[PDB]
Write a protein that binds this ligand. Structure first.
Ligand SMILES: *CC(=O)Nc1ccc(NC(=O)C*)cc1
Lengths: 10, 246
């Protein structure tokens, strides 16, 4: 989920 | 707006009341019966009108843009397993209903913040068939097409989709394309140069033995011997992904 967080918050 | 998906252009010009917020795409009518399909890993078709307009559930960001952003950082193996598991769920659901995509690629694999991944542009491989490069201005990615369609074998089956889901699989592990061909003949040459040595050791190094087994079973050149979504879901690769229902 951290990977997603970083990607979507990018 | 932004959007250019496989067969037409997707955007959002109108909206209609109640904060509808959809994706609307401009491009027999048995795609009207795709509205009756419901699965968490399928982008739901809300409505369809011929004058034709498709109206899909709006999800921005697709597996391609995610893999592009995750090019140098890579993708966690549990997330790769979860995406492959969900895509296999969607493919099993679609194939049990005799519905093919016939042209999967990462641009029609939509993702949300919850972590779900959904198959889009599905079951419409009859509205102008499957794309092919007839003119020099056209692009058409062949990197994910099964060898039977690449040759020109007229009989397509569910085994093509698996093949695509195989390539994408390897991609998620390497965020390098497995068979990056620039013509039909070059695509077949790359495919059969790779498959004809094949445990997938050097081509997908970071993938463990269960993953390489599942990949080689998903990438059988013979479509009749290619693994199905049902059998692939029961693979030991998904031993730590499977969880009871309640
Ligand atoms: C897997 C992963 O962590 N990907 C990723 C995407 C985006 C970003 N940061 C941006 O600023 C776009 C980091 C990592």
């Amino acid at each position: 989920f951290e990977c997603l967080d970083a990607f979507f918050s990018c | 707006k932004i959007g250019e998906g496989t067969y037409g252009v997707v955007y959002k010009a109108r909206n209609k009341l109640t904060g509808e917020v959809v994706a609307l795409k401009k491009i027999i009518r048995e795609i009207s019966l795709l509205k009756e399909l419901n699965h968490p890993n399928i982008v739901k078709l809300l409505d369809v009108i011929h004058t034709l307009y498709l109206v899909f559930e709006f999800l921005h960001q697709d597996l391609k843009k995610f893999m592009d952003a995750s090019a140098l950082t890579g993708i966690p193996l549990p997330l790769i397993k979860s995406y492959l598991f969900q895509l296999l769920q969607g493919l099993a659901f679609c194939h049990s209903h005799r519905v093919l995509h016939r042209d999967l690629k990462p641009q029609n694999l939509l993702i949300n913040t919850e972590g779900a991944i959904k198959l889009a542009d599905f079951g419409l491989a009859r509205a102008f068939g499957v794309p092919v490069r007839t003119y020099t201005h056209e692009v058409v990615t062949l990197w994910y097409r099964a060898p039977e369609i690449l040759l020109g074998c007229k009989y397509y089956s569910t085994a093509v989709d698996i093949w695509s889901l195989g390539c994408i699989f390897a991609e998620m592990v390497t965020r390098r394309a497995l068979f990056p061909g620039d013509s039909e003949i070059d695509q077949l040459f790359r495919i059969f140069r790779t498959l004809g040595t094949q445990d997938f050791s050097k081509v997908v190094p970071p993938l463990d033995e269960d993953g390489r087994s599942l990949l080689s079973q998903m990438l059988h050149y013979d479509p009749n011997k290619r693994i199905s979504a049902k059998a692939a879901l029961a693979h030991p690769f998904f031993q730590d992904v499977t969880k009871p229902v309640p």
